[PDB]
Amino acid sequence: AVQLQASGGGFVQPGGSLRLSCAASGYGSTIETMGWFRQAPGKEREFVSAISRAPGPSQYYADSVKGRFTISRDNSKNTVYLQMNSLRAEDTATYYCAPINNRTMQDSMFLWNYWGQGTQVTVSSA
Amino acid sequence: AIRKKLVVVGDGACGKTCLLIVFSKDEFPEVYVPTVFENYVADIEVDGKQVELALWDTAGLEDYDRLRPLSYPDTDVILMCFSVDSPDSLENIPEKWVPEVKHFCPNVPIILVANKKDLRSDEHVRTELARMKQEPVRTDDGRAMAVRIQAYDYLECSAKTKEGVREVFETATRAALQ
Ligand SMILES: Nc1nc2c(ncn2[C@@H]2O[C@H](COP(=O)(O)OP(=O)(O)OP(=O)(O)O)[C@@H](O)[C@H]2O)c(=O)[nH]1
Ligand SMILES: [Mg+2]
Ligand SMILES: [Mg+2]
């Protein structure tokens, strides 16, 4: 019943940067392990990055974003940030955050009673 | 009383179990638990006739594909479901569900059912699908698919509000009795 909400998306040029934020709302057991997911037209939903209980630079990253994306916690505000550098056209997608659990990894539709707000990231020559 | 077998199929999380449980036990499940396989019994009276319906619930997740043919033998009617929060669930009707049910349930009538119709007016659904350049499935496109696949009938329902639920099972029972 805790639900994670994504923000900070926008239009960027190839090579630019953006910081996404994932905030928690509602009541229920704390989410210890959360992930960033993204969805682009036509392609399957893609796992991007995750963070769990252990702080520090070793985290969970898809090969597609390793070294360009950095996932971290605010240490005070119960919020997870996705620092996205060297952005590329392939990164264009709607980004969501969610707990890491069997339901979120299963291959099926978004249930909007379980997913919160997404944020659009569009990378473009302009 | 007359016994008939109903089998529900459709994409994972498209509302099959909630539809069957609202109809068979008048209750809506609070927490989403994927089906493996199981069935229910419901008594229904349609057009003056008493029918004991057995309602066979199936897993829509591809991970449990191998289990689905366990449910199909001796089926009298198929509920073939998609949900309005998932345009892909409608696209999978002709791509996956129709070929499978034709193979294992030749000549068994199919009711094409749109689930979760309450979500057409849900602002969060609309907002997030729009963020991904989609929208809730419209009646016209469900009906068009029912024509394309020559479904016995096309119906829309909400297990959450109960709208349309009884009619789905009344229509399915008629199909089974034909
Ligand atoms: N708003 C709304 N949500 C619904 C409705 N029916 C089901 N849901 C919700 O959709 C999710 C999936 O519902 P189920 O009935 O368990 O889905 P299913 O098709 O049986 O899923 P599988 O067993 O994994 O194939 C749950 O979170 C349900 O509460 C409905 O009529 N309206
Ligand atoms: Mg189910
Ligand atoms: Mg079954």
Side-chain angles (χ1 to χ4, degrees), chain B residues 6-8 35-39 55-59 68 70-71:
Chain B
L6 177 154
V7 178
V8 63
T35 302
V36 180
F37 58 80
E38 58 189 301
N39 62 42
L55 313 180
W56 292 57
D57 203 357
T58 67
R68 210 172 302 97
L70 300 169
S71 292

Side-chain angles (χ1 to χ4, degrees), chain A residues 4-64:
Chain A
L4 298 187
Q5 323 290 336
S7 55
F11 297 88
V12 193
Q13 253 205 29
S17 92
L18 262 179
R19 190 158 151 282
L20 308 185
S21 297
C22 181
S25 67
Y27 174 99
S29 43
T30 66
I31 295 174
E32 292 294 343
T33 305
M34 65 78 72
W36 286 99
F37 295 84
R38 69 187 177 187
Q39 182 72 67
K43 323 192 211 183
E44 291 303 291
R45 186 195 78 199
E46 189 180 13
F47 169 77
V48 175
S49 180
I51 187 161
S52 185
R53 297 178 188 74
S58 184
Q59 301 295 343
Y60 303 84
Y61 293 104
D63 288 354
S64 52

